[PDB]
Nucleic acid binder design. Structure first.
Ligand SMILES: [Zn+2]
Ligand SMILES: [Zn+2]
Ligand SMILES: [Zn+2]
Ligand SMILES: [Zn+2]
Lengths: 113, 82, 95, 73, 98, 96, 112, 80, 99, 72
DNA sequence: ACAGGATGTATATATCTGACACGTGCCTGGAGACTAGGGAGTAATCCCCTTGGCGGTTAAAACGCGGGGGACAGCGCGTACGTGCGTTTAAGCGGTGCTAGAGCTGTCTACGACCAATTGAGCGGCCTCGGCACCGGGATTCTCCAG
DNA sequence: CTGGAGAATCCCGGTGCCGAGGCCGCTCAATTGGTCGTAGACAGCTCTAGCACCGCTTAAACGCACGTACGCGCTGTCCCCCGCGTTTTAACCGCCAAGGGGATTACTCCCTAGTCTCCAGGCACGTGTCAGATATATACATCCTGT
């Protein structure tokens, strides 16, 4: 019979904002393996969404104290460099228009006699 | 048209600014020539990789994709360009 | 016809509005975010492919992704990502 | 006149075998300890840098330090 | 009576203002000319997208800033506040570039 | 309990050694070093060529992807000599 | 029923390294859904050339060490004494290869 | 197994420095070298144990170790 | 009379030459194996190690410490010192990227 | 004055292809310890007299340490 | 700078000894031959968008100068480390013994590929208004000389 | 040890602007629902090697004595780089303009996956034998004391 469900995205089934279907397609066309399991895109999309949420929360926190309601690459760079764990995750990665983390060596400060 | 000695275009105040962003207080006078040398070596490596990527694609224009692949090649992954 | 390209822009924006209801984002920051998502996806998928090849498995399952996450992500971030992935897989299995 | 011509001819002959066959521009100052033939140092250094580890004339394989500079004078 | 700052204080002010800021510290046209010169040294008759040149400038500035950070740390290690070419060479060789 | 079958580049490395050093042997540990080196370089060239085919939206890896991968990964004059050797082998294979 | 007996693609290209095994590993390694005919030939040629270079350098080091058998120390000396071959394998360590013998000039005796 | 980091004795660290071309060694070098060695082992062994756990194995094979080293940009030849 | 005594440094140089000419392991095998098992039991209890796995770990650690001591010696020479101090290792590791 | 350099040119080249000691025949031997070049029969006869030292730089060498060369 | 005494190192012969090189039997993984269908090479087009020039102008670079503060050589010291020696520890080697788990094999079933229909998510284009850059001025804070 | 003067910086507020985000239309790829094949989980068996203990030997670790050389602090001196004002210059923005080739489409052909059979290349195993440590025995290159 033609009685079938209309549509139900795998992202909504897993309760994810990130696309399970697009991640599955990219896994299939990326030549990673001959086969891709059903739960592999779900797990990968969940991990990607968690990492995105973490970095975006940190970036919004960095933007809030700068009196800006709009995340810029400087805020993302500050969020990544302040968080030493995300910093070590993205140690060998440079961010365009992000600047650097403001720090000066303690010996370079004035003697202040 | 050909281009010559544009490595001098990376001028002394520009290198001083780059060192200031790197938290450098005092800069020797011989820092600048070595900075030209090392920046030129890095640019030769990256541009050679990007030109090889462009040549493989049968293209005569170096896109941002080629530069991004050359950077992710050398452990220098760059974000914000694709 | 017309060029078509896909990105994680709407997904990143939905996550942002979930975590920060009254905060915006710029085009350059969204490019940073898309590059980050593709880079992490490539790292995890390549590591899972390497585990599948080492263990002679012809398929990538949630076990491969979990092992790749444990290998690549550092420490507490890896633990939280593993918990989130397991939660999503268990939720997807029920529905 | 004949003596000068003969002397110039033998001087040219000396120039023939005192110059590296690979270069033929400037004088030999090195030897490969595998083929026992005299060449100049920077020609064989270039060939090693060019990853051509064969003698220019007998094609004998030589190592990184199978050639050393010769003190002719 | 002229007013002068003691040496180092203005340098510290530049350090602060260039660590707070994010814009490119190299003039765009000279760097573009340098990139094009190196490219034509590699392959002649070559064209560059503007995004490609901007990405190259971002990468080169980031690399030079990191190298200068390591060079400054080398300078402090030798009980110095000025950087020297030996500092750059040591940092590059430790990083594996030599 | 039967016997398994493990593939290796040992005989190929030995053939190359005999054709370059006819009267020089190789130890088992050095053979393991050589096999690991061959596997590493093979996987490196293959991964770079796979990424090259992915970047150009190409579904096949031909001699040109390996061409580009060798020009990239191998440094200096190793690159051009391996290019010459690979092109020579490809021409000799297409001729015969 | 008449057919050619056999001729390995390695023999066709004049290569000692296996073109067929390289081709099989290229398909099985999940690199692309298709692999050209000349790609394994060119890759086998490159692998054989690199093998010949490293093996010739190792044999040269072995002869300089008065040994007719290549040991991992000879391979390590071959890698570290060739700058191109060193930076091709810069992030690679060799088991039981030792290190290249060098001493910094300031550490030498002052001759006083 | 408790306190086996002292099993990396002082003369062993001096021998390691001698191979590294070190002429003089401070007395405080040994503890800090033991610490950084402990950090290095923690990283490599953690990756190797993750590789072993994925394979549903209870034995850490040499291939797991070389995969762990290759992950950290420290490729090792001679063990597969 | 007058028992022989090498000056401080020449014995060290002789050990440098000997241990750079040689290739064997510079750490005793049993203590390093015990250290590996100690560190491994913090990740998964009741764990077994292949012998070749322990040799591979030992080779990797020998190579890492030798390279780290090379960079440490270069840092010490940079500071116009011939002795290596902990700050040398800290600087070398931080430039290399661990710190 | 061109000829004045000519026999001056002769004595310069003629000196450096001949043996430092015998000074009468072209050099066709080397010493690999001292990186110096002598002729063949001089090093043969001076090896036969049981003095294994270089006449000019005083370098000790063995039997296999010196060999024939083709200078030409 | 030069004896020489001693220490260490580099060459020249017997001698075992496992490891290495070669010979055999399989057997399964490459080779031959042939099909078919899709990937890509080639021809054509078109429309971004890259390159090139000209002009204003103005921010930035280059130049020169005063000086001060950091680099470096030298000195002194004292202590921490190197070298050697006697002592103690445990590493190493071999041998045995037990079994846990690596590794392989046969079932089979339950997931993953494949495919037809489709439809709702996601991307391209439009447009608007508000977050933010900027101008401008005052207040605050940092620096430095001169008391 | 601060006062105060000069200069850099923060903050407050109005204004315009351009791009962030919401909306609309379309379209194509993710979804649903089946079939079918085969990958792997799963129980069972084998047997390799990992682990544990034991004992002897001796290499190595360790503790200490003693000297010395070098790590470090202090002093001088000196000269090189920083701050700053002025002049030049070419970077940058705007605008114009041409055409190069990146990107897309359409067509065809040839190249590679897939199959089936077949055989020989390579792997596991076995076995002779020979570089090769491993000693001594002898002849130079440094190390250090001494003059
Ligand atoms: Zn020459
Ligand atoms: Zn020759
Ligand atoms: Zn003579
Ligand atoms: Zn001599």
């Amino acid at each position: 019979g033609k009685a079938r469900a209309k549509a139900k995205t795998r992202s909504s089934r897993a309760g994810l904002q990130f696309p399970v279907g697009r991640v599955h397609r990219l896994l299939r066309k990326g030549n990673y393996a001959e086969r891709v399991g059903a739960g592999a895109p779900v797990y990968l999309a969940a991990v990607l969404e968690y990492l995105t949420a973490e970095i975006l929360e940190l970036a919004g926190n960095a933007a809030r104290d700068n009196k800006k309601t709009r995340i810029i690459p400087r805020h993302l760079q500050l969020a990544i460099r302040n968080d030493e764990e995300l910093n070590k995750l993205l140690g060998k990665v440079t961010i365009a228009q992000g600047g650097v983390l403001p720090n000066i060596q303690a010996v370079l400060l004035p003697k202040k006699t | 048209k050909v281009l010559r000695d544009n490595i001098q275009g990376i001028t002394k105040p520009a290198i001083r600014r780059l060192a200031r962003r790197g938290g450098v207080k005092r800069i020797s006078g011989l820092i600048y020539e070595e900075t030209r040398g090392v920046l030129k070596v890095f640019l030769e490596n990256v541009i050679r990789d990007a030109v090889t990527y462009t040549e493989h694609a049968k293209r005569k224009t170096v896109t941002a994709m080629d530069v991004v692949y050359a950077l992710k090649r050398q452990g220098r992954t760059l974000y914000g360009f694709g | 016809k017309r060029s078509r390209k896909e990105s994680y822009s709407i997904y990143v924006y939905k996550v942002l509005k979930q975590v920060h209801p009254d905060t915006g984002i710029s085009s350059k920051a969204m490019g940073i975010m898309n590059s980050f998502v593709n880079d992490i996806f490539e790292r995890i998928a390549g590591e899972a492919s390497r585990l599948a090849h080492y263990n002679k498995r012809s398929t990538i399952t949630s076990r491969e992704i979990q092992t790749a996450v444990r290998l690549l992500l550092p420490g507490e971030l890896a633990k939280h990502a593993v918990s989130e992935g397991t939660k999503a897989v268990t939720k997807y299995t029920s529905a | 006149a004949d003596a000068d011509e003969i002397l110039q001819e033998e001087i040219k002959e000396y120039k023939a075998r005192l110059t590296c066959p690979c270069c033929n521009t400037r004088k030999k100052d090195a030897v490969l300890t595998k083929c026992f033939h005299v060449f100049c140092f920077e020609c064989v250094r270039g060939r090693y840098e060019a990853r051509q580890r064969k003698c220019p004339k007998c094609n004998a394989a030589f190592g990184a330090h199978d050639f050393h500079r010769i003190y002719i004078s | 009576k002229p007013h002068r700052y003691r040496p180092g204080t203005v340098a510290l002010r530049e350090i602060r203002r260039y660590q707070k800021s994010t814009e490119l510290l190299i003039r765009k046209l000279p760097f573009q000319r340098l990139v094009r010169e190196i490219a034509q040294d590699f392959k002649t008759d070559l064209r560059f997208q503007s995004s490609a040149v901007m990405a190259l400038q971002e990468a080169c500035e980031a690399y030079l800033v990191g190298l200068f950070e390591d060079t400054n740390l080398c300078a402090i290690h030798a009980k110095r506040v000025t950087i020297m070419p030996k500092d750059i060479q040591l940092a590059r060789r430790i990083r594996g570039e030599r």
